[PDB]
């Protein structure tokens, strides 16, 4: 076949359209009474007296009821010419022949495009086409002269019969001969497999097949016209009134060079017509015909090829669903082409609705297209569409809206194949539409990621312009990943909205891309940790960029909405390094700042402290803007940074301590004071930073380090105050001997206090007034406790008489109390120095 059959189908199609069934002569029925027992042509009902009057055709001579005249199937002219042939009245035979010629000329004249189309579809020359045409014209004029055929009908089985059971048997009548099969009892899907033979010399002796339930009940019938018989047929017929019946017919006519059934011929015609209008004419594009709407899928071409397939199918008994199911199997070969997925989805939806009182899968087993054929086809098409979607971004760019439509409609066709499996083939299908599409999108994402990971620089440099010596590659890669996820979020998600609660293209994109990029980045940083050939600033910016990505696209995904992020672990060592370098820079800035402050003259606090804390706060700003979500790691950062702060401020304290015993001389009296003020300033702003780092929320180790540091600082300030008080010891000794000389003069009370205190009064007013101006609270009080200590120490080393010293003692007590600005009396009274001096006085205070 394919060469012999192709030609046979060519001939039969020509003959099928040169005289179409659309322009057929209508019978002319007049009331008729049968004088002898006749039987109706359709229902075979009896015709007799005036009580059973029928109708008669004045040209055919066919006999039927009034209620049956419309249900006939037999060309009027062909029947007439056949009758004249049975007889011999040749005059009318030729007359009718002439009228047939005329009605074929009419057709060739009116619609000549059809026959040239047939010519080109089968690639037949003009000459041979005219000869073969000329031949079929005459074959139409011979509907009896050269027709006879031995028929062999094997009744195989039936299905879905209407009864709660039945005992069906089949009767097969040709012309006068009538036979029947065995009876199967209690079976609505029986099997006969009975063979019969028939002679069909006539032409209007149709093969009547009727199924009865064992007068008997009527279960259905199929009438097989003679025009629809070739070679060896195996056909399911729907019973007319209910189920179907399967017949295996074989025909022999005369010279039938092994003709093939008209189903096979039809698939040939449809395949070649498709392969013509698609490839040869449109060069490849599958022209999509009109639609709208209830009978859209019922149309395949325009009024120029639709006529060919339809007239071929009607005049040879090919059912509509066979047409549709062959056309689908043709489109399947052109599913990739634009606009086809849609019509294939609708077409399959109708093939699906046509098959959904017998099961659905078994009913579908009755389709003559092919039990396994159609399901194998559908399987190949499904397994093909998933391959086509596994590269959807490449095969369906977001650019062309039409291509995006072909994507949406491809997913629709896939859902329709599955739906066909769930409502027709009948079975549980683990391949669920949404989940299969999901799998395909995942595969496409993997391919895409590997593609941008193999062409990072090329693509980046093409649009926005891995190494151990450089990190630019990762910045570019992140940028391109953002591009991909943004395209999946902007274009492909609105298009693939077939499954809103199970397929959010954007979120799958985000998740997959992040996972791949995450294991890649992780490995890369684990590699960089051993080597470390780049700047800490670079690792920092990369930490910042990965952060931005995760927070922008992944953090809010259900899979990663549940804490904790994993990426900050990749970077912890590098930021540790950055903290070391930062520490070193901060020390060098401390030294450099204290040189400007010394060289300037130390102009209530100076500028070096706010400079140091400005530096440290610049450093801390970076750690705070990292917004690290892993609590243990951020706690690690604070743990490491507390050490930085501690060593910095201790460095300050040690430097000033080195230069303290040098500015205390009787020269600069503002400088030491403002230095101690600076230490105190460290003491106050440290706490501000302590709460800036969390406060009590801070880690245990770090918090411990900072408070221990606080202790240390306080101790430093104490030591400093001590050293500063020692600066005045000689002057105080002078005052104590100067008052010691007047101490002996007094002899026989209130005025004497002033005369004895005058030497130290200069110190009291002159110094406690100067410190009151440029000293901090804590600073001043420290100096006061120390100075007091040293006063009591000195007045116990050099030295009416008795009362004077005690009253003066109270006077000094009040002067150091300074009313309410200096020390508190509660301390002065229970002071260890005061009671020591009083105890010393008790030895002489006897008179
Ligand atoms: Cl073929
Ligand atoms: Zn008629
Ligand atoms: Zn009738």
Numbering used by the authors: 541 to 703, 708 to 758, 774 to 800, 808 to 922, 929 to 1037, 1053 to 1190, 1197 to 1341, 1353 to 1403, ...
Task: Reproduce text from the manuscript describing this model.
Munc13–1 acts as a master regulator of neurotransmitter release, playing a crucial role in release itself and multiple functions in integrating the effects of diverse signals that alter release probability during presynaptic plasticity. Thus, neurotransmitter release is completely abrogated in the absence of Munc13s. This phenotype most likely arises because Munc13s play key roles in docking and priming that are associated at least in part to their activity in opening syntaxin-1 and thus stimulating SNARE complex formation through their MUN domain.
Here, we report the crystal structure of a Munc13–1 fragment spanning its C1, C2B and MUN domains (C1C2BMUN), revealing a long, 195 Å rod formed by 26 α-helices that packs at one end against the C1 and C2B domains. Key for the success in obtaining crystals of C1C2BMUN of sufficient quality to diffract in the 3–3.5 Å range were the choice of N- and C-termini (residues 529 and 1531, respectively), as well as the removal of residues 1408–1452, which correspond to a long loop within the MUN domain that is poorly conserved and is subject to alternative splicing. These problems were overcome by the use of single wavelength anomalous dispersion phases obtained from a dataset collected at the tantalum LIII edge on native crystals soaked with a tantalum bromide cluster, coupled with molecular replacement phases obtained from the previously determined structures of the C1 domain, the C2B domain and the nearly complete MUN domain of Munc13–1. The structures of the two molecules of C1C2BMUN present in the asymmetric unit of its crystals are very similar. The structure of C1C2BMUN can be viewed as a highly elongated rod spanning ca. 195 Å and is formed mostly of α-helical bundles, with a total of 26 helices; the C1 and C2B domains pack at the N-terminal end of the rod.
